Amino acid sequence: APLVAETDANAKSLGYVADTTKADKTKYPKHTKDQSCSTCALYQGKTAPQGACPLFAGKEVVAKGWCSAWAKKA
Amino acid sequence: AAPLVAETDANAKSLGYVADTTKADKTKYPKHTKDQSCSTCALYQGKTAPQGACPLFAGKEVVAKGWCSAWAKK
Amino acid sequence: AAPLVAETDANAKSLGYVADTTKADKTKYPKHTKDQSCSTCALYQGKTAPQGACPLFAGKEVVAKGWCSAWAKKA
Numbered sequence: 001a002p003l004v005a006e007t008d009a010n011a012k013s014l015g016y017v018a019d020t021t022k023a024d025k026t027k028y029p030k031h032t033k034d035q036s037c038s039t040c041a042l043y044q045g046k047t048a049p050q051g052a053c054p055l056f057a058g059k060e061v062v063a064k065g066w067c068s069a070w071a072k073k074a
Numbered sequence: 075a076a077p078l079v080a081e082t083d084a085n086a087k088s089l090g091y092v093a094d095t096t097k098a099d100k101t102k103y104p105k106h107t108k109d110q111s112c113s114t115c116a117l118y119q120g121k122t123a124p125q126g127a128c129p130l131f132a133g134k135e136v137v138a139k140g141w142c143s144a145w146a147k148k
Numbered sequence: 149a150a151p152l153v154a155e156t157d158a159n160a161k162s163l164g165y166v167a168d169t170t171k172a173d174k175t176k177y178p179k180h181t182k183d184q185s186c187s188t189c190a191l192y193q194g195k196t197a198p199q200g201a202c203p204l205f206a207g208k209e210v211v212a213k214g215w216c217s218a219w220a221k222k223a
């Protein structure tokens with residue numbers, strides 16, 4: 001799978017959104033639309049549009065999504 | 075994604091870690107069975123994700139369908 | 149207390165982890181600032197301690213003064 005919901009408590013704590021274009025720039029001014037789970041060093045889905053994230057147990061995140069822990073790759 | 079244990083890593087080689095439990099070395103480890111995997115191990119911290127931490131291998135993650143000779147039923 | 153993360157650990161290198169945020173690779177991570185550290189990260193579990201756990205680094209502890217690319221501003 002099931003997909004993380006934006007109302008889930010853990011999602012709220014990190015500002016997770018299923019669409020990076022809807023991220024809350026008032027809390028996270030350094031967010032860009034170039035940041036998404038697809039380009040995050042923690043995403044486990046490779047080129048797939050959905051996949052696992054270590055911060056979100058028993059759920060999958062969408063590649064076009066984002067959270068405040070978005071981690072630029074090395 | 076977080077880096078995975080390499081089967082050629084020294085601790086991996088010694089313990090017989092394999093990324094898929096179906097490829098475990100039964101000659102060295104006759105107590106292995108294909109129902110044993112990181113996913114059913116007491117030490118695996120990945121929950122339902124395809125990869126997750128194992129404290130023994132701290133620094134690199136293990137694959138949920140993998141196995142090593144330190145496997146212990148949860 | 150557990151062993152501290154080493155900057156050469158594979159998971160640390162993947163996240164650009166440094167034990168001191170003032171040594172972060174600002175060329176690779178241009179949005180880093182020294183206001184970002186584990187002590188100000190939503191993921192840090194050590195509270196006011198100088199070292200403590202982080203969910204991204206199993207079996208170890210991170211330095212509170214440290215930083216990695218997953219630094220998460222608190223909600």
Ligand code: SF4
Nearest residue numbers: 037040043053067070
């Ligand atoms: S940590 Fe990375 S993969 Fe996980 S939801 Fe946040 S941006 Fe997506």
Ligand code: SF4
Nearest residue numbers: 112115118128142145
């Ligand atoms: S101790 Fe358990 S979780 Fe760790 S690699 Fe071995 S079988 Fe997998």
Ligand code: SF4
Nearest residue numbers: 186189192202216219
């Ligand atoms: S996720 Fe946060 S607490 Fe963990 S190493 Fe990175 S900056 Fe430090």
